[PDB]
Amino acid sequence: PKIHYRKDYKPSGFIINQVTLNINIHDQETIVRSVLDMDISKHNVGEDLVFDGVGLKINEISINNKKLVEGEEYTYDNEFLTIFSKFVPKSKFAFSSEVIIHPETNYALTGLYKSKNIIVSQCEATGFRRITFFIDRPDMMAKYDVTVTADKEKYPVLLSNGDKVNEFEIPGGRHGARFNDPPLKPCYLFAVVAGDLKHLSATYITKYTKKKVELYVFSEEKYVSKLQWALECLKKSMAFDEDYFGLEYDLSRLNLVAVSDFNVGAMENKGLNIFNANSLLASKKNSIDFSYARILTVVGHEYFHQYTGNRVTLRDWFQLTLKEGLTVHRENLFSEEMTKTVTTRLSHVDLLRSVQFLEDSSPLSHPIRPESYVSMENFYTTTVYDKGSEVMRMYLTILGEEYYKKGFDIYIKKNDGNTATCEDFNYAMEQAYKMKKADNSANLNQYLLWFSQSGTPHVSFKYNYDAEKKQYSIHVNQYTKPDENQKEKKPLFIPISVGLINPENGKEMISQTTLELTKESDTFVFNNIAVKPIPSLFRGFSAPVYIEDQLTDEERILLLKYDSDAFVRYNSCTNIYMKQILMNYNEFLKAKNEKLESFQLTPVNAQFIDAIKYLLEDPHADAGFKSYIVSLPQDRYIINFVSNLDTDVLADTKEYIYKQIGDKLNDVYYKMFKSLEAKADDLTYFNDESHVDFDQMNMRTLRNTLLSLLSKAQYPNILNEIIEHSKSPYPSNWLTSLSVSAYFDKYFELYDKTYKLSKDDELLLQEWLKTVSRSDRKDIYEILKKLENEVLKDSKNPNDIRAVYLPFTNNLRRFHDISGKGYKLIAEVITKTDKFNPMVATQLCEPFKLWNKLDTKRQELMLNEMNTMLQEPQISNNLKEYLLRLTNK
């Protein structure tokens, strides 16, 4: 098991200047001929020429048009092709090869593969060596000239990077196209697509040079009518980069291609972005509302990579967060601007504090720039992407918008066309920082610890108000727990966006203020503060930390009602729920441990319930925000706060608190579910493919959240509402009608009805599977066996597999059944999946991420299954590294 370390980076002793490819696709095989025009670099020391090449069948290899001889001049072990140096030329030379590969049986979805009737490549991070021999690393920049040939009836549309420069017929019903891409790129940005594709297209005229860019969006014929929203998202993302960053697309064409078999999200191959179909295709009739924000986010993300990844490039894979965290940050600024809803930012924070904080306190914890890896395909994580994004967003918080834009433009100007490292970005932000402070000794050297230090910092607070002096003090402390990567943790540069709210009238008492905490502790004093304020802390969630606000529930309720910042309101509500959860959890645990015949539970704070009602009833408050306040914090957020968590006790805890609140508010919930109908379900623009109303979708979210509350509660006659909801034209509503019907005898009648509505659209069927898998059913195990037998079968489609199993794994009572049957079930699936797609097998491991956080019993049950999987003689290297790291072994 070979380990790559970041401090071992050294430039290659070779150069590849030019690639010329001929890819000939036949029914039973694909033949790839390649010529690499190569040189010896200044770093060369007479070493063997070693190419990456995985799973390739050699017909022949040459240097300078002379065939090499296996054994005497080269060895190939199905991973590395070693050409002994005595046979490697000392000046410029040509390497050439012809290999056979088999996209039809390439179910790992890496390299060249077949998805249904489309041939498509995926090369990031190490897929190009599955297509042909190469020094497959991102600093090897080259020019590419690519020819593809195929049966014309089966593959009429042929695509690769660059300009299509020739199209030609070939006898026996075949054809070819040649594509030349002169600008240098790394091999992971190469792509090819062949298929009977249909398209929509538009022309975009750039803002400054007025260049015409042609936009093409492609899918299989059946779904071409679901491409319109994606095309609209593409125009939006080009405008945003133009308007916010001043940046224009450089190429004459940009193609977006949807495929059915894909490994999560999309891929930014230069001018040829390829997407999971679930992140490109939607229609109002056949998609849930979530698809619309998802397409916007993923199209935008792949577009923004054109600068941050494709024009400014990575020196090595350890810099991954420099393109990924920075592109997610760019993505999030665009989505916030396009949706105009506060729930966009809150949804990002909700994701980070549940999934990413869990990772960062697990044995898998790593900093956003790791020090080593075995498998690159395990490095594409929520920490690298989403914590990376919060690190990139903190520069904007520290600088503000004008100087942030200056620093960013410095980074692009200086590094356009070249590789870069995380230091280069920090350097650019520092120059902006020096200008902003007006002080050329000011620096961001301490900022660099955000790249190297793992774990989530904890930030805690104490306060002092002197009423005679009108003087208010905020005492702040930071700490990060030691973990496997650092013995001692150092204090970070933590920007704390704050306001001070007057508790008498709800008004702001100070101007915008961002505290820079740069030491282990500091005291921040404010004068002329006329009354004791309530502090509004980490506005916008201004650093990726555990916030310990040390406020009373009285103060938190006042913030929730009156504060101006949506995140502080939401966080105050979160902190009230957490104090409640921890209290009832310990009360239930003590009763279970002591086998009590009777015990008491602390009720939910009545003024908090009142504050929720006050907000729900406010006709001017936001529907998306309302849905957050009636929902308890996610299970994976809660688990960050409890040791040895017993999942049954936590389920009983959530049940009690939901019933306490429902016993007071269910009439208000019912009333709102009814009065919301008109605007939420308005069909005015149902047949307008480009009209997307985020506010209206948030209204539907709230209706569907309230309907779920009322159904769990068995509110009188709610089944009438459920049944009517099932007749809605919106899939978000009728799939909701399936989930909430779980509590009634009508479940299976709705299962059949919604199956029939979903079964003829591949992506809608996947959404139906997720609904079933997530259903709160006592017979959920029998229902999974039914999905396997009747719907899933032996599908190797990652979307189908993920849809059937992942939502089930979040079922707190049932996945964590104390017999361990749930863990056994998922382990069996992981091991089956690993035989053909180790990436998806690793994704299906996700519930095991918290194994060492649960009660003794469950910890032992999960560890048993992990060890069973590790003992499988046919385990992939990718699955093995992951589980070895997760189990500390």
Ligand SMILES: N=C(N)NCCCC[C@H](N)P(=O)(O)O
């Ligand atoms: N887990 C992997 N090895 N594959 C991910 C490679 C592609 C990620 C794309 N760059 P995205 O960040 O979705 O644009």
Ligand SMILES: [Mg+2]
């Ligand atoms: Mg092979």
Ligand SMILES: [Zn+2]
């Ligand atoms: Zn990306």
